């Protein structure tokens, strides 16, 4: 079928990649359109596969620009310093989605989590199934990778998503677990894997010498 | 007449004068054009004098931009990263074509050749009017001028263009002459004098203690 | 026995070791000596293993100093800014002879040879039992190791000592052999292999279209 390959992921405080492949070239139209994370889809553009035909979009003109590779099937649209963008074709329609292509508009540096956790053993006053959890803090870029005991623990495992701090571009996420209360010989280790900065994080608490 | 001086040649891996002289100048519009290296024409542009009105082709408006100088009456087209250039006038005709300024798409650098010639005395088997030549390989930037015994041997003399070389963007030219087997006390010297590089080579071969 | 280990050969534009061995030490007297190439033996100094009695050479106390080690039975002698050096005991006698240590007062930089052989085929005027040899010219440091086609050809070999240039501090060699003049078809490679410059050259010479 019509199928694509988009690439790839970067962070920039700039070309994407768009490559046509399994049909004939030349028969529909790269068309490039974004969406601002949690939100709606914004239409950027068309080109034809015969001319580079701009109609760009009023408010993309200037940042987006897309340009042609007839030759070899792909399509290239470049920009200038925040989304996940996306080329489609048959220009009336939308049916030839491709892959999804995350930019961010970023000036942070590649770190690693500074995980501050609570694992108590389900004892931090009288519940039977109390709480646990890390706080996966300070990384870029995204994401992390969270497992329990190496994945051991699944049941009540809730992964939050990143929130993005406004202090220095560093997201935070946290991964929490309810374990009961009859569990207090079990450790629960959160193993954070932040990959782009290759980052291996495993966590626990414990008491203050309770009563 | 009508006379242009265009310049010049350059090496990127880009701003081209047209200076129009010998008539009044708001007469006539300058008009872009330019051939790839063994291909057709491709028109570029045609700017008013008066003004800057681009009107340019639909493939040529992202990479090349023309600009006007209507005080002095020099024109300039401007270029981002491999062929001749012409600027003409009288868009309707194209009667006043100017001087031919060759841009290269180039990555190499300026280099001498290395001949690797053979210049046997027509005495590799039997042959009466056998063959020699020398083989000038790796240089950058174009051309080499290449002379038989500082210019003497001019008959026979066939240079071959520089065939550009997918290795290292080094292009390849070898000059052949045709002497006669009753010649054998007769070196040739191509005299290769590649001058961007100004290196001077010159050459000859001999045998292999034969019989 | 007593044996000695000296260390090591050096270019200075400076310890020298002296490893005693195989016997008991505090027992004979560390004398350093030294010899300048092609010259006679200039005595240095004598220290006891016990203390740093000094008692160098009137000529030699500034430039070299003579240090003890004497719990790991080493000793050293320090030189600041030409020949060959020695480590002797038995300060009466001179029986214990040390290895042998050459430094060089360099400034040169270490580099390959650049042989500008004869190697004809005995064929050069008329002579029967004629000549050839390699000009192994411009290396740095010492020395070259040169083999006539990988060391076949050993009769007639007569290879020169490094005579030292006044140009460059760069010593220059010839090794010479004397084949016959019925061995024309027969090529005679030196192969000059400078090790401490890591290069290994390989030459033979034609001759020039005779009759």
């Known amino acids: 079928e019509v199928q694509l390959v988009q690439s790839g992921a970067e962070v920039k405080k700039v070309k994407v990649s768009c490559k046509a492949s399994?049909?004939?070239?030349?028969?529909?139209?790269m068309n490039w359109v974004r969406q601002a994370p949690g939100q709606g889809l914004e239409w950027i553009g068309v080109?034809?596969?015969?001319?580079?035909?701009?109609t760009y979009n009023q408010k993309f003109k200037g940042k987006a620009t897309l340009t042609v590779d007839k030759s070899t099937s792909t399509a290239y649209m470049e920009l200038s310093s925040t989304a996940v963008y996306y080329c489609?074709?048959?220009?009336?329609?939308?049916?030839?989605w491709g892959q999804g292509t995350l930019v961010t508009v970023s000036s942070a540096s590649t770190k690693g989590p500074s995980v501050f956790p609570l694992a108590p053993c389900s004892r931090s006053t009288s519940e039977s199934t109390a709480a646990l959890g890390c706080l996966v803090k300070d990384y870029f870029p995204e994401p992390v990778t969270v497992s329990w005991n190496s994945g051991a623990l699944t049941s009540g495992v809730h992964t939050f998503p990143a929130v993005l701090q406004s202090s220095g571009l560093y997201s935070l996420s946290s991964v929490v677990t309810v374990p009961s209360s009859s569990l207090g010989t079990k450790t629960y280790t959160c193993n954070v894997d932040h990959k782009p900065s290759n980052t291996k994080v495993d966590k626990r608490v414990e008491s203050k010498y309770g009563p | 007449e009508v006379q242009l001086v265009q310049s010049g040649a350059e090496v990127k891996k880009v701003k081209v004068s047209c200076?129009?002289?010998?008539?009044?100048?708001?007469?006539?519009?300058?008009?872009?054009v330019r051939q790839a290296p063994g291909q057709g024409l491709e028109w570029?542009?045609?700017?008013?004098?008066?003004?800057?009105?681009?009107?340019?082709?639909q493939k040529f408006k992202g990479k090349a931009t023309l600009t006007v100088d209507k005080s002095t009456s020099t024109a300039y087209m401007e270029l981002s990263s491999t062929a001749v250039?012409?600027?003409?006038?009288?868009?309707?005709?194209?009667?006043?074509?100017?001087?031919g300024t060759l841009v290269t798409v180039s990555s190499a650098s300026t280099k001498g050749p290395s001949v690797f010639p053979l210049a046997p005395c027509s005495r590799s088997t039997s042959e009466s009017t056998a063959a020699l030549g020398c083989l000038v390989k790796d240089y950058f930037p174009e051309p080499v001028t290449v002379s038989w015994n500082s210019g003497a041997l001019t008959s026979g003399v066939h240079t071959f263009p520089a065939v550009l070389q997918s290795s290292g963007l080094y292009s390849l030219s070898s000059v052949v002459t045709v002497p006669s087997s009753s010649l054998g006390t007769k070196t040739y010297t191509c005299n290769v004098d590649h001058k961007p590089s100004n290196t001077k080579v010159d050459k000859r071969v001999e045998s292999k203690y034969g019989p | 026995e007593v044996q000695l280990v000296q260390s090591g050969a050096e270019v200075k534009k400076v310890k020298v070791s002296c490893?005693?061995?195989?016997?008991?030490?505090?027992?004979?007297?560390?004398?350093?000596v030294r010899q300048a190439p092609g010259q006679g033996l200039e005595w240095?100094?004598?220290?006891?293993?016990?203390?740093?009695?000094?008692?160098?050479?009137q000529k030699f106390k500034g430039k070299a100093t003579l240090t003890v080690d004497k719990s790991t039975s080493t000793a050293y002698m320090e030189l600041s800014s030409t020949a060959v050096?020695?480590?002797?005991?038995?300060?009466?006698?001179?029986?214990?002879?040390?290895?042998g240590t050459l430094v060089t007062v360099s400034s040169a930089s270490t580099k390959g040879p650049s042989v500008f052989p004869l190697a004809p085929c005995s064929r050069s005027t008329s002579e029967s039992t004629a000549a050839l040899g390699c000009l192994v010219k411009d290396y740095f440091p010492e020395p070259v190791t040169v083999s006539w086609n990988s060391g076949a050809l050993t009769s007639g070999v007569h290879t020169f000592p490094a005579v030292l240039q006044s140009s460059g501090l760069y010593s220059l060699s010839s090794v010479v052999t004397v084949p016959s003049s019925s061995l024309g078809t027969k090529t005679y490679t030196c192969n000059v292999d400078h090790k401490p410059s890591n290069t290994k050259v390989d030459k033979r010479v034609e001759s020039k279209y005779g009759p």
């Open positions: 080109i034809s596969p015969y001319n580079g035909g701009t």
């Open positions: 399994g049909y004939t070239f030349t028969d529909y139209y």
């Open positions: 489609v074709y048959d220009l009336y329609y939308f049916d030839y």
